[PDB]
Design a protein around this ligand. Structure first.
Ligand code: ZN
Lengths: 221, 290, 99, 299, 199, 288, 197, 394
């Protein structure tokens, strides 16, 4: 939430200009947009119709650069490192932060070995230095680092923009949660009604006990 | 008396101008009351000869009036800086400089007492708060120092934040802070590896407790920039004095930064955060979207 | 003379604070910090434990002091054993009267 | 109506003071109304007092057979269960607090005193009755509120209780019944000696229009707390006491059974065992509900 | 009767109304029965009686060595004085059992602090072969005093600690089955008596 | 209006403060107007106590205070008297600010606010709105914070808004529900109903968010990607604990409670076994 | 008699249910009065109990064997030979008895599957009761040759010293599975109701 | 008979189980395989039994034994539940004659199956101890059919019809468990015979005691010299007189002297063989070796194979390994062995009581206790309504 409004102010300026730039002016625009060390969501610029007609011209490299930042990773960049333009150190640093977010989306305890492969570091100290000064202190995530088990827990992590093929899963995930909440309603209700039925049946049954002996007492007296 | 001192200080002033502050201190020594005391104190403080002058200023402070444009408070603050050299009066001094900070912003004569003096006092007040240790009141005045002001423009901002917000202070940054810290060469005392070294490593170890859960002794040397044996020594007494919370082991050579609660209580925190985020989505959209 | 009394009170005072923030202190480590031969360190350490001043135990094989760990819920586990034993006696007596 | 409980009327209050109809029969008062603010203040202070007793005073008016309690305040007196009439230590505090509060909004006289028995009952001890005897002797309207801060957390509700002391010699020819309470074995002796000296009174809860509106809005933001909370958090030593305390009662019952041979320490013990186990199982039921609803499954 | 250790030593020390006998025995029998605190109170904190203990410097030195974990020296001194000690009626009547008790006390005090006691060291420490000390340890542990298990491969005495929680679960479940079977046997036994009374 | 607070501290309110302020306004108005058109809704004043650790400002209790009408400020003699008395009972709470009843803070309060900077230099100003409105859906209170600016050279201490959370203990929870929904059941139904009502409130919000997303899926609903990011961040933490460490402890507690239940039943059976056997002995006498 | 269910189970390779089929059918066969001491699949009945580990009942059944049919057919004598090793816990001797008198076409497979099951059961004992075992005794208990025993164990992870001819035992790994009970609130409610009378 | 001719029509006509048939039964109370052969089987009910009883009234056997036994099997299997339920002593007399037919014709297993079916239908409640229970137990035990006769043995029997039938049910039921390797239940049934009210000594009481001691040694591992308190006064005063040789075996087992146990069995082999106990006693001979090794578990942590053999006086190395391997199979010990050093390591119980499996074990035990309370409650109501109880307390 706290990270949302920080992008919100910058997004409005970005979308306002991007809605009006000519074909060439988007070139420098995308470079700074992916390099600002606050902006992590870019699909709003992607959804803006001006970039739709840019696909096809000589600036097509810029669009694929945006798509990588919209939904992509370091492993994806290395495979297609030829066509994509050379990135300044600031751009690379931003995408390394996005690496943790994607892995933190489908997991909560991140093993060390997975992190070294994706982030391309050498020893434990280099990896831990990156996490402290670029992930937790930036406010992107909030966790704790362990050294004996070599794992990094990620309780809170800001989500990323949806790649094509996630909204359908969101509805199923939400609907499944709704059904579990709903099925817990009648399940609770049945337990309460079960207590009433057993209590009433018992009190009627014990009532037949003393009435049985009350007749017995007077019969033999 | 006063007439002899004025004539002697006139010769002292000429000596002080011509790189003879040592001769100026001897000659001068040998809010009208405050002004006379401040003139002797200022030369004494500048040449670090406040002996026999701080008491004289204090003796005249009883009869010292206020009048108009009293710079005696600044001289007392400078005297407090000499007090803060050894008596560690920075806690009172830092609040004093804040008084002479942009808090008292007005015409105030010229820019030497309303533009530059406040900026220097603001910078000085920040440094003194850092020098003091512990200080729940020091934490309290740290809040208002970071609280807007011009500190964001100030050059010491990085340190201030890293101090205010418990953050790991890297060795290269603390060297610059100590390097610039040369007010009277008493603050940077070399007495038993200084006190800033003991103060900085205390703070860096304090910030690492929240950030970690356990750490081997070998990696406690890379950060904190010290040999593992020394790091084990300071970590021992810090726990002994009930500063941080944790335990120490040697077979694996690790320190368990516990400072937490049971996983059931940790589980409850996740649930509370889970429900809290649910409310903000509805509240954020209902208020803004519609 | 009074040296024997004078020596001990200084020795145990520093030793008690030395091992306070430690779960497993090393026997050679105590010798080097206190500048005392390891033999006397061992003799002082065992004598302190027999007086219940120290809480843990010492590893003769590996030269370590296994300080007692944090005590989990034990009175609850102690009480149920007393609850169990009393329930054993009452149930046996109740049944054994019809004969 | 909702605001008519207020307005201490001095010209009306003095009317009940002169008639003094409570001198003849001790059974005059049969109702104790308690305001919303007072109960909240008493509970917080008692809960924050730990395992040691506390003490305090409350102020209120009176009307007919009901003793209304408006507000309460604390008093730094230690060991109210040991020293009888222990309020004399802060007598200067009582004078200053009442005098200072009279200027702004406070007008009601001090009515009674309250303490907090920490987890062994909601009753009046032999020391407690003696203190109330002197206070009732001097000031005729005098209550004694006893609240339990541990069992309040434990099962589901506040363990409040109000009492009024009978005059010496007056033997009540009614023998009223009372609800059974679990008493630790180190406090039963005091209860047995003093049982027909403190008749109880009914307790209700009223509030004002503004108070009722805030509480309704306040409760609607409590569903988060009702879920993300485990009351069985520090109850590891508290539960150990009763389980241990149940042993000697069983041991005494077994020893008494062989010598001879509600039912003597057999049905009561069963009630105590159920009164301990059910609350723990009730806490377990909440954990299972939270388990399925949140820890559902990956996909 | 009159063959106790702690009470007998207390009575011998507390003489209402010779001097060598008072100096002898006393703490020797007390150490066989009294614990560390009681022995310390009755010897070290007994300056009134320690004045008599000064007349017997060897006995006081042996008591201190026992208190200072010097089992070898005091054991050797007692062995040297064993012939002389058991020649004064009071010890001549019963000396072997007293010495046996001091030995057992020495073992239990030895194994108390350590967790990983080495039996090889105790062999020459107590001047006994490894097999003999092994048999003594079997005798002690079978009496459930030295709570430990003897590893017979590398000659290490690994101390034994209980888990309580796991022990409690085993004990409770066993109790329930015993109660369950007895109650079922209760019903059958009651009906047989009912049938007989009808006849 | 008042901008957000840049201090970074977090404020944790307590319900005690809520009930104290409302009662103070009730007593004054109910007596100013003839109890047997209450001029203009009157106002009260007082101070709030509480401790501060790290970057958290916590408020626990408060006391009233007479407003001096002569100099239009707060008299110091009464403040000292009240402060001394509270320090004896509460030895760890210091003054953190002042309270008043009203709708919106004005610049006149700034002159008063400047007086309280002597103690706790940067205090807070809790304001309560007593206007009874049924259309509101939150507690009518705003917590303001002292802000030193340099706007146009003049200091111009401007009040700014801060975010607060109503943090409460479990003990306060029990009393609140006892008084709010005062009884005009047994024990099992009462316990389950509390959880039952909470889940019902939870279920409604999940449905409400569901309708908006499904409308986004097929309906018009112009895309709002901002809510999508927060939804995914919300959705990536559902399994809560999801660890073998938690499972071992959770199943540990489950078996511990069953063990007490097993022993509790046997005590009940033993009690039930007792008296029946004496009924057998008094009928089929063994002495025969 | 109507031996079809016995024949059907053998045809369907229902060796687990073979033992239960004969005893149920035998009671009905004896009740009516049809002679069975010389018609009943007596050899098959004995071997069926060995598969499901009821060697005790096989002993009484063999005690009820007609004396003539013992001297008539060698299959029943050979079938009881395996049982003698199982009763006496001769782990290595079972393989000798299994590879003995040539089994007819009927018991074909019904013996091979049982022999395969014995090896699987024997392996579990070795995994849970051994740490270091020589390859010589490994071949004896598991059954096959030294070269085959060495090859088989290394496919399960058991590593073997090539100098002293001994294999070191490990407990392989474990699984996770799941619980999926969902019957938790119902049971808890029952205990609460019964607890408070 | 003249009424029998109308009864045949009434069998397929005037049914009225509790009316017409009731009247018919009353009339009967107050053929020659020709008219009965033309009668019905299920509809006849008491009529079929009356014809069967009259036809079997003769003392004819052998040839008549074979014919009626096959015929009775058809009637028993094809018997209506209601007709069998209302059947008095008449029914059990038919089943008693059926057994005698089998024991004389040939193998007792020939009619074991049909006899067991009668118990299933005639039993009204699972708590009813029918007089037919000892009847089928004797047949299955003698016919070498331990597996088949164990299905009847239950644990919900609380009602006693004939006191002799309870002793025979428990005694024969115990013998089934011992031969079937079911020592857990074998103790329970045999425990009730000794702990039963009896004025004087009985033959069954002594025979149950002898089996109890040996079974206790095999399973428990000790001999308690004191009889349980909940026992008849006659048993306490006199029970050792006839258990002399058996008592000495237990004392030797408690000590641990293998030589005395190995010599006492051979020395007094005559007495033990007489009571058909020698087969079971030898099972207790090899139980000492398993017990002594179990004692070392709570005394060591790692021991060598050679030392184990010397301590228990067993033999060579392979003997010690073989005993350990068998113990691990049963579950009486948790150990691991190695052959580099020839040593045995005594592990601890892997059970943690922190698994979902323990929940089901705990839950089943909880549910059993709940059912136990109901039985106690039902006892209370019947006694509270007993007219004798009110009179004495009144
Ligand atoms: Zn009290």
């Amino acid at each position: 939430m706290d990270i949302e409004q920080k992008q919100a102010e910058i997004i409005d300026q970005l979308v306002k200009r991007a809605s009006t730039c000519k074909s060439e002016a988007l070139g420098p625009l995308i470079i700074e947009a992916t390099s600002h060390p606050s902006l992590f969501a870019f699909s709003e610029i992607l959804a803006l119709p001006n970039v739709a007609q840019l696909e096809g011209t000589t600036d097509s490299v810029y669009l694929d650069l945006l798509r990588l930042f919209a939904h992509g990773t370091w492993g994806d960049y290395k495979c297609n490192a030829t066509r994509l333009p050379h990135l300044s150190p600031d751009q690379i640093l931003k995408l390394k932060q996005l690496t943790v977010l994607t892995l933190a989306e489908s997991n909560k305890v991140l093993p060390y070995d997975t992190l070294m492969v994706e982030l391309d570091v050498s020893n434990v100290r280099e990896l831990e230095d990156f996490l402290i000064n670029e992930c937790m202190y930036a406010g992107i995530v909030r966790g704790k680092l362990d050294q004996l088990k070599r794992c990094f827990e990620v309780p809170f992590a800001a989500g990323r923009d949806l790649r094509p093929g996630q909204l359908g899963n969101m509805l199923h995930t939400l609907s499944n949660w709704l059904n579990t909440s709903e099925n817990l309603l009648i399940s609770i209700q049945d337990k309460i009604k079960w207590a009433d039925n057993m209590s009433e049946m018992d009190k009627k049954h014990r009532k037949e006990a003393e009435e049985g002996v009350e007749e017995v007492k007077k019969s033999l007296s | 008396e006063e007439q002899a001192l004025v004539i002697r200080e006139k010769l002292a002033g000429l000596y002080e101008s011509e790189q003879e502050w040592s001769k100026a201190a001897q000659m001068l020594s040998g809010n009208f009351k405050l002004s006379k005391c401040i003139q002797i104190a200022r030369l004494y403080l500048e040449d670090d000869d406040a002996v026999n002058a701080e008491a004289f200023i204090n003796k005249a402070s009883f009869l010292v009036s206020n009048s108009q444009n009293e710079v005696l408070n600044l001289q007392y603050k400078v005297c407090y800086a000499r007090i803060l050299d050894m008596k560690r009066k920075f806690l009172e001094a830092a609040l004093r400089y804040y008084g002479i900070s942009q808090i008292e912003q007005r015409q105030i004569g010229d820019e030497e007492i309303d533009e530059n003096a406040l900026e220097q006092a603001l910078s000085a007040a920040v440094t003194c708060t850092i020098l003091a240790g512990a200080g729940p009141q020091r934490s309290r005045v740290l809040a208002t120092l970071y609280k807007d002001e011009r500190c964001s423009k100030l050059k010491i901002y990085p340190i201030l934040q890293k101090v205010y917000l418990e953050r790991i202070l890297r060795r290269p940054e603390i060297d610059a802070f100590s390097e610039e810290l040369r007010p009277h060469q008493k603050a940077s005392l070399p007495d038993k590896s200084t006190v800033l070294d003991r103060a900085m490593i205390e703070h860096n170890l304090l910030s690492a407790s929240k950030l970690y859960t356990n750490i081997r002794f070998d990696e406690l040397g890379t950060l904190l920039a010290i040999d593992p044996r020394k790091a084990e020594k300071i970590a021992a007494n810090m726990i002994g004095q009930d500063r941080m919370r944790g335990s120490i082991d040697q077979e694996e050579a690790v320190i368990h930064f516990e400072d937490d609660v049971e996983e059931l209580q940790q589980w409850d925190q996740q649930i509370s955060g889970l429900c809290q985020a649910l409310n903000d989505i509805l509240d954020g959209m209902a208020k803004k979207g519609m | 003379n009074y040296m024997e009394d004078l020596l001990k009170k200084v020795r145990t005072q520093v030793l008690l604070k030395l091992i306070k923030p430690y779960t497993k202190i090393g026997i050679p480590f105590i010798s080097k910090e206190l500048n005392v031969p390891e033999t006397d360190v061992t003799e002082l350490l065992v004598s302190l434990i027999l007086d219940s001043r120290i809480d843990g135990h010492i590893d003769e094989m590996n030269r370590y002091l296994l300080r007692g760990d944090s005590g989990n819920g034990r009175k609850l586990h102690k009480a149920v054993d007393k609850w169990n034993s009393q329930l054993k006696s009452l149930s046996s007596n109740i049944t054994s009267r019809v004969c | 109506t909702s605001d008519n409980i207020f307005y201490y009327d001095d010209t009306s209050q003095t009317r009940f003071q002169q008639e003094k109809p409570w001198e003849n029969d001790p059974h005059y008062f049969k109702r104790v109304k308690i305001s919303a603010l007072a109960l909240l203040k008493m509970v917080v202070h008692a809960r924050s007092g730990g395992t040691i007793e506390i003490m305090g005073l409350m102020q209120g008016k009176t009307d007919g057979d009901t003793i209304i309690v408006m507000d309460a305040f604390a008093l730094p007196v230690e060991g109210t269960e040991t020293r009888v009439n222990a309020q004399d230590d802060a007598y200067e505090y009582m004078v200053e607090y009442s005098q200072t509060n009279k200027l702004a909004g406070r007008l009601e006289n001090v009515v009674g005193w309250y303490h907090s028995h920490p987890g062994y009952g909601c009753w009046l001890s032999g020391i407690d009755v003696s203190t109330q005897r002197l206070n009732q002797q001097h000031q005729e309207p005098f209550l004694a509120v006893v609240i339990d801060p541990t069992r309040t957390v434990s099962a589901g509700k506040v363990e409040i209780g109000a009492f009024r002391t009978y005059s010496k010699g007056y033997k009540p020819p009614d023998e009223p019944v009372s609800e059974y309470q679990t008493i630790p074995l180190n406090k039963i002796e005091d209860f047995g000696v003093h049982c027909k000296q403190y008749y109880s009174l009914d307790v209700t809860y009223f509030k004002s229009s503004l108070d009722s509106h805030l509480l309704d809005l306040l409760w609607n933001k409590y569903w988060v707390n009702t879920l993300s909370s485990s009351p069985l958090l520090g109850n590891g030593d508290y539960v150990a006491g009763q389980i241990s305390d149940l042993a000697e009662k069983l041991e005494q019952a077994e020893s008494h059974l062989v010598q001879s041979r509600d039912e003597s320490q057999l049905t009561k013990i069963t009630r105590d065992s159920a009164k301990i186990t059910v609350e723990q199982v009730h806490g377990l039921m909440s954990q299972v509900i939270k388990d399925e609803l949140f820890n559902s499954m990956r996909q | 009767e009159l063959k106790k250790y702690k009470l007998a030593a207390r009575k011998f020390l507390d003489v209402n109304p010779a001097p060598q006998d008072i100096a002898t025995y006393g703490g020797l029998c007390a150490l066989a029965s009294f614990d560390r605190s009681e022995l310390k109170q009755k010897v070290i904190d007994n300056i009134n009686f320690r004045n008599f203990l000064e007349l017997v410097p060897d006995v006081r030195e042996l008591i201190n060595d026992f208190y200072s974990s010097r089992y070898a020296s005091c054991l050797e001194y007692l062995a040297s004085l064993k012939s002389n000690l058991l020649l004064d009626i009071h010890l001549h009547d019963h000396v072997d059992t007293l010495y046996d008790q001091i030995r057992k006390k020495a073992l239990i005090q030895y194994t108390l602090p350590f967790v990983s006691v080495d039996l090889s060291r105790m062999a020459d420490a107590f001047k006994t072969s490894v097999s003999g000390l092994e048999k003594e340890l079997e005798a002690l542990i079978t009496d459930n005093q030295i709570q430990a298990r003897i590893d017979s491969h590398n000659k290490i005495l690994y101390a034994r600690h209980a888990d309580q929680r796991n022990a409690t679960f085993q004990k409770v479940l066993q109790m329930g089955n015993e109660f369950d079977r007895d109650v079922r046997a209760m019903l059958l036994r009651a009906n047989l008596l009912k049938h007989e009374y009808h006849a | 209006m008042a901008p957000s607070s840049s201090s970074g501290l977090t404020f944790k309110l307590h319900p005690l403060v809520m009930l104290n302020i409302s009662d103070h306004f009730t007593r004054v108005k109910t007596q100013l107007n003839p109890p047997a058109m209450l001029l203009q809704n009157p106002r009260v004043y007082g101070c709030v106590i509480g401790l501060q650790r790290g970057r958290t400002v916590e408020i626990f209790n408060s006391f009233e205070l007479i407003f001096d009408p002569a100099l239009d400020t707060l008299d110091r003699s009464f403040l000292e008297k009240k402060q001394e008395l509270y320090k004896k009972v509460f030895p760890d709470f210091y003054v953190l600010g002042w309270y008043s009843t009203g709708s919106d803070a004005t610049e006149s309060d700034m002159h008063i606010h400047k007086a309280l900077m002597d103690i706790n230099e940067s205090p807070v100003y809790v304001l309560l709105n007593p206007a009874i409105n049924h259309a509101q859906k939150d507690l009518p209170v705003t917590i303001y914070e002292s802000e030193f600016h340099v706007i146009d050279g003049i200091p111009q201490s401007i009040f700014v808004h801060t975010s607060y959370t109503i943090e409460t203990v479990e003990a306060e929870r029990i009393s609140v529900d006892h008084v709010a929904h005062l009884k005009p059941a047994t024990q099992l139904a009462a316990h389950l109903t509390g959880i039952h009502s909470a889940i019902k409130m939870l279920n409604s919000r999940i449905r409400v968010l569901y309708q908006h997303i499904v409308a986004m899926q097929k309906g018009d609903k112009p895309c709002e990607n901002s809510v999508l990011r927060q939804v995914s961040s919300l959705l990536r933490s559902l399994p809560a604990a999801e660890s073998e460490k938690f499972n071992e402890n959770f199943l540990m507690e489950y078996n511990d409670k069953l063990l007490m239940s097993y022993l509790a039943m046997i005590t009940n059976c033993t009690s039930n076994m007792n008296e029946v056997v004496d009924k057998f002995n008094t009928a089929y006498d063994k002495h025969s | 008699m109507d031996l079809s269910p016995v024949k059907e189970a053998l045809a369907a390779k229902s060796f687990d249910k073979i033992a239960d089929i004969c005893d149920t059918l035998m009671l009905q066969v004896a009740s009516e009065g049809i002679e069975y001491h010389d018609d009943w699949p007596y050899a098959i009945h004995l071997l069926g109990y060995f598969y499901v580990d009821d060697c005790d009942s096989a002993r009484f059944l063999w005690k009820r064997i007609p004396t003539a049919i013992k001297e008539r057919k060698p299959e029943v004598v050979a079938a009881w030979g395996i049982g003698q090793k199982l009763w006496t816990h001769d782990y290595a001797g079972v393989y000798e008895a299994i590879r003995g008198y040539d089994w007819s076409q009927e018991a074909k497979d019904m013996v091979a599957a049982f022999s395969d099951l014995y090896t699987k059961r024997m392996f579990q004992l070795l995994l849970s009761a051994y740490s270091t075992i020589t390859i010589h005794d490994l071949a004896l208990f598991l059954g096959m040759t030294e070269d085959d025993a060495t090859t088989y164990v290394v496919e399960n992870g058991w590593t073997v010293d090539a100098a002293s001819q001994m294999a070191s035992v490990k407990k392989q790994a474990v699984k996770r599975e799941q619980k999926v009970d969902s019957s938790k609130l119902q049971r808890l409610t029952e205990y609460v109701f019964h607890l408070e009378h | 008979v003249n009424s029998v001719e109308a009864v045949i029509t009434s069998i397929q006509g005037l049914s009225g189980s509790p009316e017409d048939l009731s009247a018919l039964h009353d009339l009967l109370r107050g053929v020659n395989f020709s008219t009965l052969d033309q009668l019905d089987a299920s509809k006849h009910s008491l009529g079929y039994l009356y014809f069967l009883e009259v036809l079997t009234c003769g003392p004819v056997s052998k040839e008549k034994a074979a014919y009626e036994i096959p015929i009775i099997a058809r009637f028993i299997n094809s018997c209506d539940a209601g007709q069998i339920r209302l059947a008095s002593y008449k029914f059990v007399s038919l089943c008693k004659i059926l057994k005698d037919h089998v024991i004389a014709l040939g193998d007792p297993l020939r009619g074991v199956g049909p006899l067991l079916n009668a118990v299933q239908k005639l039993q009204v409640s699972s708590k009813r101890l029918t007089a037919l229970h000892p009847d089928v137990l004797q047949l299955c035990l003698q016919a070498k059919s331990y597996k088949s006769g164990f299905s009847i043995l239950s644990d919900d029997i609380v009602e006693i019809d004939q006191p002799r039938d309870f002793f025979l049910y428990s005694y024969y039921g115990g013998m089934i468990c011992i031969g079937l390797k079911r020592f857990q239940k074998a103790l329970e049934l045999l425990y009730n015979v000794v702990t039963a009210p009896m004025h004087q000594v009985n033959a069954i009481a002594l025979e149950a005691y002898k089996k109890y001691i040996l079974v206790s040694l095999i399973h428990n591992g000790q001999f308690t010299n004191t009889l349980p308190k909940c026992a008849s006064t006659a048993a306490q005063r006199s029970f050792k007189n006839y258990t002399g040789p058996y008592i000495e075996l237990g004392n030797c087992y408690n000590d641990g002297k293998i030589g005395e146990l190995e010599a006492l069995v051979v020395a007094r082999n005559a007495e033990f063989e007489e009571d058909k106990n020698l087969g079971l006693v030898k099972q207790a001979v090899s139980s000492l070796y398993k017990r002594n090794i179990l004692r070392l578990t709570q005394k060591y942590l790692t021991l060598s194979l050679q030392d184990i053999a010397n301590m228990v006086q067993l033999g060579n190395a392979k003997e010690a390994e073989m005993h350990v391997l068998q113990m691990i199979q049963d579950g009486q010990i948790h150990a691991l062995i190695n052959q580099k050093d020839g040593m045995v390591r005594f592990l601890e119980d892997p059970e943690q009581y922190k698994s979902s499996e323990m929940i089901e074990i705990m839950d089943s035990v909880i549910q059993r206790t709940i059912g136990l309370s109901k039985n106690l409650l039902a006892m209370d109501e019947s006694l509270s309504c007993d007219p004798l109880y009110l009179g004495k307390v009144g």
